[PDB]
Design a protein around this ligand. Structure first.
Ligand SMILES: CN(Cc1cnc2nc(N)nc(N)c2n1)c1ccc(C(=O)N[C@@H](CCC(=O)O)C(=O)O)cc1
Ligand SMILES: CN(Cc1cnc2nc(N)nc(N)c2n1)c1ccc(C(=O)N[C@@H](CCC(=O)O)C(=O)O)cc1
Ligand SMILES: [Ca+2]
Ligand SMILES: [Cl-]
Ligand SMILES: [Cl-]
Lengths: 159, 159
């Protein structure tokens, strides 16, 4: 099963290349807990923003360009990405934009972080009709000394 | 000598009610490089914000209240804070507002990180007379894949 995991600001805006103007360690922890011990698929800009292989996860980079680094797996197509994953219960797609567009149709689950921040931006997480998806978990959190903005974690199941 | 090290947004904002919305690892790396192996003096709110003792430095907390952590040194006066640093060439004051106000008069150098961001602030860096300070180093950088805003490092020496 394929799942997409993303942190969205108001209007579904997501990052493009530069880091997003928010500071949410709670969301990085959530991100870690849900992707650890699973394969993760990401595009080239996400890989540069991360800056190193995520430990405890098989790192698959989907891109047209060449593999700089030998520590990760570089694939040129969606099909190739999937295969690199092997037979596992759940595959995590971690962005960016175009990557989410390509895998959404195949997605059965969504782990989203709705952040209360207005950011100006070009990219948006793909439009999804929440009535083709069932909201199974929702938990709100206020901003605090460590987290810059309020945020809400949500898991959706493809109905 | 005593030096003050701070990150200031536009209008000299140094803090907000919650965590600042900047994701700036380069500023934390400039912060570590300039404070490593030196004693650091901070207020209680900054201490609670960091979360742990900073590695490789002598952590001194200036507070009227009683200490809650055995790994650091708790002091109640500026005079006490200084004495606790001993005989070192340079003592670093890392915030927040009130602590900076108390130590400014005694500081000979400022290491500042100007961040290009407009925010509503809670606390601000004290007003300094740009005429009493000599900029001896400046370095601008744009936002990038890992840094959310553009910023500029500057070191000033009292004239
Ligand atoms: C820029 N980027 C991609 C990123 C960031 N937040 C997201 N948050 C969510 N919810 N979803 C994503 N797909 C997402 N992706 C990053 C950057 C750093 C780390 C990171 O360092 N993660 C550590 C945890 C925090 C740490 O070690 O400093 C980990 O083990 O996953 C993860 C993703
Ligand atoms: C909230 N806080 C206070 C903070 C943050 N940025 C500042 N930036 C500047 N330039 N000056 C300050 N006084 C400043 N203070 C922090 C928070 C974290 C760390 C911190 O973990 N720094 C690590 C380096 C970063 C890392 O290894 O993740 C260190 O070793 O100094 C420091 C100060
Ligand atoms: Ca100069
Ligand atoms: Cl990407
Ligand atoms: Cl403080």
């Amino acid at each position: 099963m394929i799942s997409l995991i993303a942190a969205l600001a108001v209007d579904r805006v997501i990052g493009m290349e530069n880091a997003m103007p928010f500071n949410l360690p709670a969301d990085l922890a959530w991100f870690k807990r849900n992707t650890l011990d699973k394969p993760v698929i990401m595009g080239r800009h996400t890989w540069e923003s991360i800056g190193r292989p995520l430990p405890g996860r098989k790192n698959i980079i989907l891109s047209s360009q060449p593999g700089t680094d030998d520590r990760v797996t570089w694939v040129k197509s969606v099909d190739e990405a999937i295969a690199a994953c092997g037979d596992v219960p759940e595959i995590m797609v971690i962005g960016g934009g175009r990557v989410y567009e390509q895998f959404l149709p195949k997605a059965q689950k969504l782990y989203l972080t709705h952040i209360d921040a207005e950011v100006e931006g070009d990219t948006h997480f793909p439009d999804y009709e929440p009535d083709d998806w069932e909201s199974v978990f929702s938990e709100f959190h206020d901003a605090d000394a460590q987290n810059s903005h309020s945020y809400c974690f949500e898991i959706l199941e493809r109905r």
